[PDB]
Amino acid sequence: TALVCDNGSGLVKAGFAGDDAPRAVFPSIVGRPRHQGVMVGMGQKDSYVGDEAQSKRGILTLKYPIEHGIITNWDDMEKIWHHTFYNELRVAPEEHPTLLTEAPLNPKANREKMTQIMFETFNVPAMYVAIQAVLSLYASGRTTGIVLDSGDGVTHNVPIYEGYALPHAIMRLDLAGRDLTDYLMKILTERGYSFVTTAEREIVRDIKEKLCYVALDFENEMATAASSSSLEKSYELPDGQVITIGNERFRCPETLFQPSFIGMESAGIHETTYNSIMKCDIDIRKDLYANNVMSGGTTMYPGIADRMQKEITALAPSTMKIKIIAPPERKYSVWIGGSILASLSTFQQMWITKQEYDEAGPSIV
């Protein structure tokens, strides 16, 4: 078949057209040496990518080619695709049409660079670049809906109508899956104990993906912390230090509603949905209010939907009913709807071919 890729800022999901579950999901990690040298038993490898880089640490810088939804480093991104084809999917690029996905606001310079490389460094027989929030809406079973794709580096509000993104309302706030982790670390160190230690990244994001929740009411909750141990959730770190975390458990994911909790100045995701849905025509605003879908990584947290709804209930005039659809698959949707779309028959004449590239070049994308 053909291949599909969600290149995250820190999670690349890959596979084919026609499967409902991603064939390969590795972090977008690029590991480069802190000095040329070796590790005993291995030699000097070209670079690191993904799990391999991460699960060792020591010897490397551990960068990322994508930040905030946009591709910033390019050489590294190519190294990752090299690790997606032969290394993850066990294929040669030239045999298999590839689909990769971009951020809703993604620069035309970025897209030209991407479709360039795919037909030069890789030489794939057909490619597509698709659009993160929009594909998630396809996986969400809808032509139309303002989606809230909070990946790893950003949320993205996008008023999709009839299978099209409306650009002038496409909001994006620079606080998400990543900024939310490091904040959870420092706040446990504020509390009690040295929550500082390199591996404790992955430890204190595992905490993030479980014990955290978006409190439905911060004012009630910060006080409830001081009333009852109810909120306190314990966690055995691998060393056996049964710790317990309390108000900070929310005080972290709440950053999306109050950006002041990390340090962005912007008003929060409720208001960024409201202020985009306003940049739409008064008419398409109702459907947006009925098909509002959360997507990506940072949408995981207990409460994040109802919190949104409540918030947009304050923000909405009395009549307008807000309806948030939390997807079961949410961290994968952008892959899912890509595959299914790429297998939809007619779409065979809706790829970018090697041929129209050797003719039109990057300017087709």
Place this chain on the structure above:
Amino acid sequence: TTALVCDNGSGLVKAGFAGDDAPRAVFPSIVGRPRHQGVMVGMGQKDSYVGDEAQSKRGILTLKYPIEGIITNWDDMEKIWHHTFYNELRVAPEEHPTLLTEAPLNPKANREKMTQIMFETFNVPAMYVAIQAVLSLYASGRTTGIVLDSGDGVTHNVPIYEGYALPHAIMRLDLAGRDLTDYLMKILTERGYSFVTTAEREIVRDIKEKLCYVALDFENEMATAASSSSLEKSYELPDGQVITIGNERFRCPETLFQPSFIGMESAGIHETTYNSIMKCDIDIRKDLYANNVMSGGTTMYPGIADRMQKEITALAPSTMKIKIIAPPERKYSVWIGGSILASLSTFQQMWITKQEY
């Protein structure tokens, strides 16, 4: 009578009286409680000891530091605090108002029990317990700013405005002074040395005071050290041999910014400073950025100020005046604040007297 002030951290207590500008009893807040039956090479055998003699006792008494930036062990704290008003300060509690400082985030449960003990086990006629770095900014002569308070155990950022450190933005980092010594210790160990016991460890910490520095740029420094001898700063070890050290000198305290050298990823002292200034709201930021203030035993490190001038500017949008203020007094400024503040006539009616309690 006059009031007393006693600042507590994970390492050095400072005790004294109000009025004086300089702390009286600075000692290791170390107790030593008997491990088993053992006899000193000197003294016979006796119970728990606080201070320098406990360091010389090391193998007969188990040695605790009662404060890990928060009071962990309650009896041990009291053990010191008797040794303070009595063996150090040479006075009695009943005559004497006393101020104890504290590390900012201190849980309510600690504070309630702290009030109890000193009115009861000790019986001071009135007392106060007070937020450390606010008293540093005060000893710094300021209504505002942000202290980076870092010493033997815990490191802090307090964005202060008009009396208050912004609570939610008081950033803590538990990488501080012991973390630095035990790194500097491990480096030299790898090279073929080994301390462990008592004297040699302390020697390694003295080395930290004399040879160590944080350089502005770690990659240009990483280079020059490994290139040419300029940095090769010697020391005369108590056996005889000169340990020459060039790279390790700056390498050791770099753990404040790049903590990953020991193995720590949570946000470095610089990044914590950017994010406390941000973790507030938005206008007061300037006179936080322009009054980054250093206090505590660790901020003693040379070069550290020039480096933060880089380290904040890098992230802070161009038109913010970054200025790092660091007092010469710095290791005691929480006491120096606390004396003057205790002595304040204006503050008399805030001495919680033994009747209200």
Place this chain on the structure above:
Amino acid sequence: ALVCDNGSGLVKAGFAGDDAPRAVFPSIVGRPRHQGVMVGMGQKDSYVGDEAQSKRGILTLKYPIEGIITNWDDMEKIWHHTFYNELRVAPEEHPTLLTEAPLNPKANREKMTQIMFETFNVPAMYVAIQAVLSLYASGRTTGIVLDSGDGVTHNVPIYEGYALPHAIMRLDLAGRDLTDYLMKILTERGYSFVTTAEREIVRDIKEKLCYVALDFENEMATAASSSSLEKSYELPDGQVITIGNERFRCPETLFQPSFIGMESAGIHETTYNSIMKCDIDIRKDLYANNVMSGGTTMYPGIADRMQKEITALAPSTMKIKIIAPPERKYSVWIGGSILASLSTFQQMWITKQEYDE
């Protein structure tokens, strides 16, 4: 006397006599995170213009003026900042002129009349509609205006030194939205501009690169054909942008509000539509004399393009002339200073005694 031009973004002040405005600054005030009362301690007034931009609060950045002044406290605050901060004069001594937006509420003028005489104690105040003045910088009493400052574009008809409300067409566009559009499109060529410091870089780019191309379609094609529209600009830090189609996309926004996503008609549609609302015969003088003012008429090409559309929209025998001064950006003040200097007609200057009454 003085002249002090006020609006949703920029405020120009000086004396009657001078050719060019003495002080020009942003109408931004900050209002506190709620410490204090309206009458009580603390800086209600706070921070105006650059001082408020530099930090941004907390003291939340209330622009008071949307052409129409929404809330009168913040205007008082600016007017303090003008006479006392910007000019450094004595308001009691120096009769002030202030410049009002056509379709200001009459009650809004009453409050302007009051705050001047009461809090500022100015001996006499005058107030004049920004449009007729825009024509007095072009030497006329009569004519159709397209003012396009930083806030709201303005299609104002004038007969014999008076504006005709029934035609005065607003468009919620100018200057600001014009840069915040430019930010979205620079993003397409990598340059996601984001900070306020970057919006100051971006605003220089508007003036240097962005220009009202005579036609939209023939222009699009030349861009797509050939690089000649594209021109590199070096960013102050060291970088260089290149911009092509986008260069004219950015001013085109006046003619096409669908670009930003606004339900409102382009300046060509509104200019005309205001003149149709004019008297069937006076229309001739107005058409014959269109005067166009503001930071967003500074755009090169704008006069000929306006003239092209109005000729294609007005009858074959319609004698139209557009007028923009080379000093157009400031014209409300230049028009104002002439009036404020007109010492013979003087009794227009309603005094403190013509207010004691």
